[PDB]
Write a protein that binds this ligand. Structure first.
Ligand SMILES: CO[C@H]1CCCN(C(=O)c2n[nH]c3cc(O)c(C(=O)N(C)c4ccc(N5CCOCC5)cc4)cc23)C1
Length: 209
């Protein structure tokens, strides 16, 4: 059912650095996650040009931002290519190894945490604001999976039994108690206008009722 994995040593080191460094420019996490969603949308868009049946699992190519004050969660949903079990457990972590090592050397050489995206490890900036991150994903070639980590050196992967998503990735940020500003409509709008004004897919902010 649920399998537990150890993060690659370098990624575990980067995650503890992100969690324990005093750094007030935390809003960068949202730019990084939207950029990752844009890359996944680019991939499915590109593949569909030679195989239009890749869009049978959904033609709409977009990003949704869903704050939820009651649950203290910020969800970023996209209809990109999605991730396989191999991506989640091995392949994305393997590729992230060099970028993680390089990023930590750069930080030691005086670089700022905001440069994280230049090293292909932008995702991990989610741990500036989140105590736990849940990622639900569905790739055309595989089953729906749920990845999760509260850091501490491990992550879990399980087959997801929840609502089918067709194709794409849903990033669920379980925010730290002092990071609730990222659930505010005006705050999300400000961040998106400042960092993500030039993304080639519609970004829809879901207003709470
Ligand atoms: C446990 O899950 C996490 C495992 C660690 C890496 N993760 C993310 O970086 C991530 N954050 N938000 C996303 C949204 C998405 O749609 C996807 C996605 O489906 N794919 C295919 C995807 C995969 C890789 C990238 N790259 C961005 C540039 O840096 C090199 C990786 C981009 C999109 C992934 C993410 C996900």
């Amino acid at each position: 059912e649920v399998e537990t994995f150890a993060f690659q040593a370098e990624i575990a080191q980067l995650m503890s650095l992100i969690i324990n460094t005093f750094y007030s420019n935390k809003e960068i996490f949202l730019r990084e996650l939207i950029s990752n969603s844009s890359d996944a949308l680019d991939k499915i868009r590109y593949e569909s040009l030679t195989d239009p049946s890749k869009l049978d699992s959904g033609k709409e190519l977009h990003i949704n931002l869903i704050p939820n004050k009651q649950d203290r969660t910020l969800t970023i949903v996209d209809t990109g290519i999605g991730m396989t079990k191999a991506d989640l457990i091995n392949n994305l972590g393997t590729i992230a190894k060099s970028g993680t090592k390089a990023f930590m050397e750069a930080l030691q050489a005086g670089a700022d945490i905001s440069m994280i995206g230049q090293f292909g490890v932008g995702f991990y900036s989610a741990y500036l604001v989140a105590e736990k991150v849940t990622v639900i994903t569905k790739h055309n070639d595989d089953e729906q999976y749920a990845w999760e980590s509260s850091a501490g050196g491990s992550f879990t992967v399980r087959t997801d039994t929840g609502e089918p998503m067709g194709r794409g990735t849903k990033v669920i940020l379980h925010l730290k108690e002092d990071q609730t500003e990222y659930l505010e409509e005006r705050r999300i709008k400000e961040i998106v206008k400042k960092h993500s004004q030039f993304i080639g897919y519609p970004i829809t902010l879901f207003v709470e009722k």
